[PDB]
């Protein structure tokens, strides 16, 4: 019962759909055509921008299909999308296969986006962990 405001910077790309209810997160589409050589990386644009609610965080997870088959992953693998960030969501993909180049077409769903409530804790410095062990 929570609404995540999203602006489509690329109207040619479909809105991210959640499909079956209960799925972890919506998948994000690629707006660029990039080819990743074995070992290289690139910052792919998704063409969409979201407004993560306060006290939550947007998380960009790789997709098990592409990761297992061609070996495509994300460098900052638990990608953080801060609540205050309003710019274009980008995905930093990387070709982990030793000698097989990866080709990404426009519109392909490269990664999925999860939103979890993070506990904004307040750090307190202590001499030692007394009252703990």
């Amino acid at each position: 019962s929570t609404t995540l405001a999203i602006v489509r910077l690329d109207p040619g790309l479909p809105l991210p759909s959640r499909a079956h209810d209960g799925d972890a997160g919506v998948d994000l589409y690629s707006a660029e055509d990039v080819e990743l050589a074995p070992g290289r990386r690139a910052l792919v644009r998704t063409g969409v921008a979201v407004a993560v609610p306060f006290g939550m965080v947007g998380l960009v997870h790789p997709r098990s299909g592409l990761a297992t088959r061609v070996g495509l992953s994300i460098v900052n693998s638990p990608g953080t999308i801060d609540a205050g960030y309003r710019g274009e969501i980008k995905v930093a993909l990387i070709n982990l296969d030793p000698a097989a180049p990866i080709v990404v077409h426009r519109g392909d769903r490269i990664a999925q986006l999860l939103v979890q409530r993070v506990e904004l804790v307040e750090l307190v410095e202590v001499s030692s962990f007394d009252e703990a062990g």
Partner: protein
Amino acid sequence: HYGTIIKTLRKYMKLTPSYILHRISDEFKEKGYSPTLNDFGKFDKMYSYVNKAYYNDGDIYYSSYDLYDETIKLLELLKESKINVNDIDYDYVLKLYKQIL
């Protein structure tokens, strides 16, 4: 083919996934028509099979790219082998799925 997008779907259920709806519109701007819209009865039965295999088989869940695209290739493989959607078994669909995957 925006008008054809919603009205036809009502007739399937005799009523008087948004990503799937956008994919059909991609066929109108590409091939002029929608091969999936006219034979939606065979697609829904196959998409309901492809849906069950992604959520109950590890080899599918960990090796799939696009559920819609996999349903289309499976329907083209069954049309090539001239096999009907009614006389098809879910277990038989799984064996063809892992091959394409």
